[PDB]
């Protein structure tokens, strides 16, 4: 309900992960992968070889901590499931 | 207003989607009530598989026993793509 103050760079992890997931999804679909399968394999194993080099998806995903991507997945899930 | 027919040993009727929602709600409430950042405990659990990250509260520990982390992370990823209209 309450208005939030915006400080330049406030939403940087949320926005960073959103940008990354959009590009990673496109890279996976274009190369014929099951995007959910490959993202799960990467997040569980930390093995970047589950992500294509296509569209620089592998290098881009390696620039974020897996814990930061999982954090955003968890925060998004709670919010979209009205948990709070 | 939910119930269960006690007519054979039942190891659960919930779908994985239902189980993940129940786990995430129970853990969030338990941690939020006690002043913890719940997201950090859930993330630490998903990175490790160590139940010590999760409070012993209701059947939290029994829910993580029954779910695999690949299934929890699959549900998180599916939900994230859906809710951000990705694909």
Numbering used by the authors:
A (entry chain A): 5 to 88
B (entry chain B): 2 to 88
Authors' description from the paper:
Homologues of the 90-residue ReoM protein are found across the entire Firmicute phylum, and include IreB, a substrate of the protein serine/threonine kinase IreK and its cognate phosphatase IreP from Enterococcus faecalis, whereas ReoY homologues are present only in the Bacilli. Therefore, ReoM, ReoY and MurZ likely affect the ClpCP-dependent degradation of MurA. PrkA phosphorylates ReoM on Thr7 and PrpC reverses this reaction in vitro; ReoM phosphorylation at Thr7 in vivo has also been observed by phosphoproteomics. Our data are consistent with a model in which PrkA-phosphorylated ReoM no longer activates ClpCP, which leads to MurA stabilisation and the activation of PG biosynthesis.
